[PDB]
Design a protein around this nucleic acid. Structure first.
Ligand SMILES: [Ca+2]
Ligand SMILES: [Mg+2]
Ligand code: NA
Lengths: 51, 231
RNA sequence: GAGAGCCCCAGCGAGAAAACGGCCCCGCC
């Protein structure tokens, strides 16, 4: 589960009902796949800046 | 920072610099949001009064995207102890909100259990600041990759008490460490290209000394308190 | 874990030349 490659989550992984549940820091939205985290704005937390 | 490398454009956008009456940097900070900065409690005893600079890479030339924010409130941990630097943490709320832009962006607060299992267990973290380049303040923002050091080795290495609010990172004899002027700044841990707050530069028995390590405020112990201080 | 006693309280309250105990976070029978 979460100990197998972070449950395939981009960010936070935890277990509930014997299943992986992925989540994301503030300023991200969990993707439709339930795993990837999508920035809601141009300067999401934890990303080095490119412009 | 002793050793390490310069932060290249956009590489350390969460670095804050605490500046005194003379516009001289004396501590770092970590940008957490538009209004909030994480720093070390002991940095509040270093100047009579101060402000916070964001977006700086080269202090020697005030040239473009820098901005200076006044502090609205200081939220020091009630349990900070000067004698030990136990509970070495504070949050600053700024009077005006930071505009995120190139070189200005928050570091992520992780969830505690996941931070423990997944961040603190990584090989290294990243520390940054404008502090001294040997045990002589850097004009340029520097960063350094610091291996996590296990608690037993940390305590055995130290002549002063290492509390559960502290952790070791850095190297035994290799000449790389945080130093004076870096205190209060970011220790972040990278996970899939996203950088999460894991520490606050706290103290060291000198800088980069043989048999010694960098001592950091263990942010996991304070995530609930940080949330209190930011609500 | 849980009660309780004290300590702490540069955040929300209240008060009296702007580090000066009701509540959130937190410390030591
Ligand atoms: Ca500059
Ligand atoms: Mg008081
Ligand atoms: Na060392």
């Amino acid at each position: 589960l979460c100990s197998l490659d972070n449950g395939d989550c981009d960010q936070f992984c935890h277990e509930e009902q014997n299943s992986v549940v992925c989540s994301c820091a503030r300023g991200y939205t969990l993707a439709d796949n339930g795993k990837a985290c999508i920035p809601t704005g141009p300067y999401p937390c934890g990303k080095q800046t490119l412009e | 920072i002793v050793g390490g490398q310069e932060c290249k454009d956009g590489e350390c956008p969460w670095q804050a610099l605490l500046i005194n009456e003379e516009n001289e940097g004396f501590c770092g900070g970590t940008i957490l949001s538009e209004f909030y900065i994480l720093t070390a409690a002991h940095c509040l005893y270093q100047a009579k009064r101060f402000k916070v600079r964001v977006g700086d890479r080269n202090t020697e030339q005030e040239e473009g995207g820098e901005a200076v924010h006044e502090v609205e409130v200081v939220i020091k941990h009630n349990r900070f102890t000067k004698e030990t630097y136990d509970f070495d943490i504070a949050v600053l709320r700024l009077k005006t909100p930071i505009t995120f832009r190139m070189n200005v962006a928050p570091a992520c607060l992780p969830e505690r259990d996941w931070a423990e299992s997944t961040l603190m267990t990584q090989k290294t973290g990243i520390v940054s600041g404008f502090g001294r380049t040997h045990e002589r303040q850097s004009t340029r923002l520097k960063m350094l990759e610091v291996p996590y050091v296990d608690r037993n080795s940390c305590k055995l290495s130290s002549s002063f008490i290492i509390t559960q609010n502290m952790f070791c990172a850095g190297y035994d004899t290799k000449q790389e460490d945080a130093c004076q002027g870096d205190a209060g700044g970011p220790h972040v841990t990278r996970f899939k290209d996203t950088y999460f707050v894991t520490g606050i530069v706290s103290w060291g028995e000198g800088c980069a000394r043989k048999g010694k390590y960098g001592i950091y405020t263990k942010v996991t112990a304070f995530l609930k308190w940080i949330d209190r201080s930011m609500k």
